[PDB]
């Protein structure tokens, strides 16, 4: 049975298999169970990445080295490959004879231990058509008598859903729980494993790189356990140096390389922002101000919040920034958010909250619970942010949604993690949560029934408190109140729309020229403080786009031309000088 | 895909768990990156480490063929792994890796393909390249934490417009030969830009390559004689128009005459209320002429007036003249707030979830149509 | 049905993803276009490029029936693809394609029939013609975006009254001979 079972001691002697550091309490309990009279079959149950196989495989490494109790010395540990047992078991009884013969060898020497990784598999292996004769029944009578010792290793999910079902087999196996190690316990493990990884990549790791890898992975890599998680950052870091030229950075990997690897794994911006990104970040405020005017206060809050995150002063577990942009209509609340993601080159997560008007609609964000038709679909918000952890989350018209939906965002702003129906935890630490609401629009624009008209600006704030619970408003970084667009900024907005018009006309091959006098006429004609700048988009469409459209289809503008717009002082009307060219 | 490939080589060169995983949305060329790795190896662009390496594609269907007897699948699976371990320089590529979770499953046995390969991935003896979508990776693959721990996820994202055009230029000689036609530089530029603006529910690499491929068959097969060797921008626009149901450059074609008589024809069928016809006919002209908003509908008009004056007639007679479907929605049914579910379907975990939304499904079926919400105030 | 057929031929001639899907309501000639494509090929109305091509009508129920094993389905299914892969001009017709996506050949697992043909369709090795209703297309189909990407969608609309009366005229000889009766033109209208 040499092909089905390998001798770990032989492998550990000629080479090395993950030298175990620590785990004295875990290995002592396992040795205690293995020294029992009956049911001396430990079961290393733990989460993936907690060193279950390391403890079993490392036991052999310890035995050869000699740091084991005298009772455990002289013993041989064998690893069972369940795939090799069922290799040629075509004929009836090939598995039973093959498996039973293997157990006889262990009983003869009476000093050998069997390691069966993924022990949950043997529960049903060996059934040909409808029989219960399997490795579980074939081993069962030999485990309760203490003739042989077998070490098992399986995950909690497999142990609870499969292994725990067989009460008879579970009783024979003594569940030895394995707990994730601490931050300090992990650095000593990497130090013991470092000589094996250094030789593979022919590099060297610094004392600070190891401490940073463990700490940085725990913060950002929240999907795997600490022992495997930290090793991934170390193993992948050395690979970069090997791929890089032998002369530039092949000797050693600095701490800067560790943060770069973790950033790519978590899809988050790396620390020590380069000068290239700094130029874009510094100019973010100026670029935004060229597309949105009259709301410089809001741009400052958004840009400043992002700077704190990159600079390293961001919140420990809260998002980059949580804001509730409230104000009049058409004042740039959604435009600033749509133009923020483009400036930073990140995905835009636009959510229309006018659809989440019912309590039952919350299942779309976090997914339906288990046992329902909607379990496969999953949460739309949790899935969207997992694929794009670095993005801008926009909840347009959040006030329209039911108050129940607001409660979901309490942990998104206080803790930064949302638990999906499947159990995974979304991460909002690098998400710029932005919310827009038009609450108080009726109240602020209303006219008081009195002699002295009143400043109803303070009425929207009161509505914000009635709709949003204090616990929700307290989590927000700050509430920015947008102001009505003045006559001076309206002129800039007109230029923006005219520029967009030129882009449309440029595709057709015709160039537009509008005199400054005409621009002022359009501004005063469609200037409505209460209605924002959306009416300005219609005074241009009716005055400029409508004549051009008729000429483009029926006129000289079919081919590339140079149209001009002018205002006659006598009539105060627009004149369109269409030219065929 | 230099950034995506660079990380793949780094993971493959790792001491343990050197099995990269390519997780991305469908249509982002995940298989192309894995399959394209072998192509680069032949040319020699890859580094010296990746040189002299062979990439094998696993056919799970064939592996599970004729394995009715016990132990047949285990022998085939453990025979291939031995070959990879012995070579020490081969790499396995498993397309749609979410299938190995249940592969080889028995009546009551839990000896799956993943369980057998599991001890070989953590050790680092073999290297495996996977490619699964986000939906399959979470619902079917992420559930097995043990297997996922042995793989390194690589997030692939749809390339930008500037990057997609370069991809088509590299693939263009393959499509040109098959379709015996030539694609102009502007044609490729238009397909990428037009696809993003009009084609939806598909990613940019697939979208752009669909317009380019379909355009070759049209020019090669639509004209029986007097064929067009080249493929100009006009042809690409028509193909995109068929996929998305609306044209962008045929407005100065015979349809041009229809827009001129649209206002006059409506006046004949509906007398009076000329101001309303002018609003609809001018909005369509601006949209078709290329002066649209590009982020809003063609037009949103709230026709308010007395009963029987033409509010529900101009709209009905606007679809017939334009030859487009009429999405008639009577708002008298949506009297309560709970009726909104009928428009956008019920949320997950509730009855009627599979039914979907009437308004959303209707618009998806007929994107080019007139949406009529009669008696909106009653809602 | 020349308009609908022309769209299908354009898709079949594509280098990749040449797998048209006929989407239409019940009783709208969903299978009359696939079956009739073979009739056109034999007669010769199809373009020259489509000549020498053979349409195969797959029966999922018959193939899936009698497996009683884990590998019997893949044994026969892969054998079918091997035949089609050998003949580059061969075309497959899968009536009611929505059945494979739900549960092709596996329950409580993930080795489905669709996954087997996913890589082949992406490479253009085989041509597959599918037929599924709008109701079975939005709920069952499109859930696995990967399979939906390979299959193009051809819109099928219910014909007008003038089109159906002409269609019945072509079918009159078959029905008349079967029943040994005559149908007056006025009766058909």
């Amino acid at each position: 049975t040499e092909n089905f079972t390998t001798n770990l001691n032989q492998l550990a002697r000629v080479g090395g298999i993950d030298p175990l550091i620590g785990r004295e309490k875990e290995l002592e309990r396992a040795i205690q169970v293995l020294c029992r009279r009956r049911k001396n079959n430990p079961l290393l149950v733990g989460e993936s990445g907690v060193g279950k196989t390391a403890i079993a495989e490392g036991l052999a490494w310890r035995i050869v080295q000699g740091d084991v109790p005298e009772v455990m010395a002289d013993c041989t540990i064998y690893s069972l490959d369940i795939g090799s047992l069922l290799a040629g078991t075509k004929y009836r009884g090939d598995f039973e004879k093959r498996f039973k013969a293997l157990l006889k060898q262990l009983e003869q020497d009476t000093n050998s231990i069997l390691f069966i990784d993924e022990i949950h598999t043997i529960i049903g292996a060996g059934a040909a058509s409808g029989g219960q004769v399997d490795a579980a029944n074939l081993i069962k009578p030999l485990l309760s008598s203490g003739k042989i010792r077998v070490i098992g290793s399986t995950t909690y999910q497999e142990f609870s859903n499969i292994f725990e079902k067989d009460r008879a087999l579970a009783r024979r196996f003594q569940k030895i729980d394995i707990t994730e190690p601490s931050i300090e316990e992990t650095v000593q493990i990497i130090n013991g494993l470092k000589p094996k990884y250094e030789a593979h990549h022919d590099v060297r790791y610094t004392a600070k790189a190891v401490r940073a890898a463990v700490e940085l992975a725990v913060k950002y890599i929240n999907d795997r356990h600490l022992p495997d998680k930290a090793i991934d950052v170390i193993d992948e870091a050395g690979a970069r140096a090997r791929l890089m030229p032998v002369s530039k950075r092949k000797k050693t990997v600095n701490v800067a390389d560790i943060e770069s690897v973790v950033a790519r794994i978590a899809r988050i911006p790396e620390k020590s922002v380069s000068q290239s990104d700094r130029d874009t970040l510094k100019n973010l405020g100026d670029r935004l101000k060229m597309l949105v005017f009259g709301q410089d206060k809001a741009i400052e809050a958004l840009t400043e919040a992002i700077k704190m995150a990159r600079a390293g002063l961001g919140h420990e577990h809260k998002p980059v920034g949580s804001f509730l942009f409230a104000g009049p209509t058409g004042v740039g609340k959604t435009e600033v958010t749509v133009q923020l993601s483009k400036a930073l080159g990140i995905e835009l997560l636009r959510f229309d909250m006018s659809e989440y008007m019912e309590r039952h609609t919350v299942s779309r964000l976090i997914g339906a619970p288990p046992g329902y038709v909607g379990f496969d679909q999953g949460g739309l918000l949790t899935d969207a942010v997992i694929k794009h952890p670095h993005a801008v989350l926009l909840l347009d018209e959040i006030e329209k949604a039911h108050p129940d939906v607001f409660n979901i965002l309490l942990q998104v702003m206080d803790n930064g993690t949302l638990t999906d129906n499947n159990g995974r935890k979304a991460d909002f630490r690098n998400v710029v949560l932005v919310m827009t609401t038009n609450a108080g629009v009726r109240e602020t624009e209303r006219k008081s029934i009195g002699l002295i008209h009143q400043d109803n600006s303070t009425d929207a704030m009161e509505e914000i408190k009635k709709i949003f619970t204090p616990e929700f408003r307290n989590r927000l970084d700050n509430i920015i109140w947008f102001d009505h667009l003045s006559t001076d900024v309206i002129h800039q907005v007109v230029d923006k729309f005219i520029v967009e018009l030129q882009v449309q006309l440029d595709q057709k091959g015709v160039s537009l020229e509008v005199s400054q006098e005409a621009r002022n006429w359009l501004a005063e004609k469609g200037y409505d403080r209460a209605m924002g700048a959306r009416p300005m988009a219609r005074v241009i469409q009716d005055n400029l786009k409508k004549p051009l459209a008729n000429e483009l289809l029926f006129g000289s503008l079919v081919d590339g031309g140079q149209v001009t717009v002018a205002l006659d002082k006598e009539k105060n009307e627009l004149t369109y000088g269409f030219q065929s060219a | 895909r230099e950034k995506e490939l660079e990380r793949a080589i780094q993971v493959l060169c790792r001491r343990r768990k050197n099995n990269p995983l390519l997780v991305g949305e469908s249509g982002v060329g995940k298989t192309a990156i894995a399959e394209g790795l072998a192509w680069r190896i032949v040319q020699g662009d890859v580094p010296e480490v990746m040189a002299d390496c062979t990439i094998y594609s696993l056919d799970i269907g064939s592996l599970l063929a004729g394995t009715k007897y016990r132990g047949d699948f285990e022998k085939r699976f453990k025979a291939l792994l031995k070959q990879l371990e012995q070579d020490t320089n081969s790499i396995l590529f498993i397309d749609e890796i979410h299938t190995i979770i249940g592969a080889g499953a028995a009546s009551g046995g839990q000896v799956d393909a993943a369980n057998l390969i599991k001890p070989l991935l953590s050790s680092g003896k073999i290297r495996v390249i996977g490619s699964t979508t986000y939906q399959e990776f979470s619902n079917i693959f992420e559930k097995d934490r043990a297997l996922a721990r042995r793989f390194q996820k690589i997030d692939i994202t749809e390339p930008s417009i500037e990057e997609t055009v370069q991809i088509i230029n590299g693939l263009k000689p393959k499509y040109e030969a098959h379709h015996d036609v030539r694609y102009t530089a502007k044609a490729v530029r238009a397909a990428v830009e037009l696809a993003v603006k009009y084609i939806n529910d598909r990613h940019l690499p697939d979208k752009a390559i669909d317009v380019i491929d379909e355009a070759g068959a049209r020019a090669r097969l639509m004209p029986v004689s007097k064929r067009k060797k080249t493929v100009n921008v006009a042809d690409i626009e028509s193909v995109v128009a068929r996929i998305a149901r609306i044209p962008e450059k045929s407005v100065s074609q015979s349809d041009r005459d229809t827009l001129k008589n649209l206002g006059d024809r409506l006046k004949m069928l509906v007398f009076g209320q000329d101001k309303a016809i002018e609003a609809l006919t001018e909005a369509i002209k601006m949209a078709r002429a290329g002066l649209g908003h590009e982020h809003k509908p063609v037009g949103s008009f709230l026709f308010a007036g007395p009963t029987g004056v033409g509010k529900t007639e101009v709209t009905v007679q606007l679809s017939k003249a334009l030859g487009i479907e009429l999405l008639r929605f009577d708002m008298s049914e949506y009297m309560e707030r709970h009726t909104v579910s009928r428009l956008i379907g019920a949320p997950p975990g509730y009855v009627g979830f599979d039914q979907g939304g009437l308004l959303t499904d209707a618009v998806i079926k007929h994107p080019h149509a007139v949406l009529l919400l009669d008696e909106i105030e009653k809602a | 049905r020349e308009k609908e057929l022309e769209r299908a031929i354009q898709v079949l001639c594509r280098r990749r993803k040449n797998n048209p899907l006929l989407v239409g309501e019940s009783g709208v000639g969903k299978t009359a276009i696939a079956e009739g494509l073979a009739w056109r090929i034999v007669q010769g109305d199809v373009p020259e490029v489509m000549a020498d091509c053979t349409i195969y009508s797959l029966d999922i129920g018959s193939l899936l029936a009698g497996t009683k094993y884990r590998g019997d389905f893949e044994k026969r299914f892969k054998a079918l693809l091997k035949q089609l892969e050998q003949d580059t001009n061969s075309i497959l017709f899968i009536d009611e394609i929505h059945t494979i996506i739900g549960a092709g050949a596996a329950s409580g697992g993930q080795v489905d029939a669709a996954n087997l043909i996913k890589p082949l369709l992406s490479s253009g090795k085989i041509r597959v013609i599918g037929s599924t209703t709008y109701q079975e297309f939005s709920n069952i189909f499109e859930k696995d975006r990967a399979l939906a990407r390979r299959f193009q969608k051809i819109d099928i609309t219910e014909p007008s009254i003038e089109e159906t009366v002409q269609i019945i005229n072509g079918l009159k000889p078959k029905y008349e001979a079967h029943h040994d009766v005559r149908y007056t033109a006025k009766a058909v209208r």
């Binding site: 059934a127 | 499953a105 509730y350 | -």
Partner: peptide, 25 residues
Amino acid sequence: GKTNDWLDFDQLAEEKVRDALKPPS
């Protein structure tokens, strides 16, 4: 507003059985 109604989803169970062979001689 009327109370909402939730609908459960039941999954069917079907498995494949292997087959052992016995040679006559």
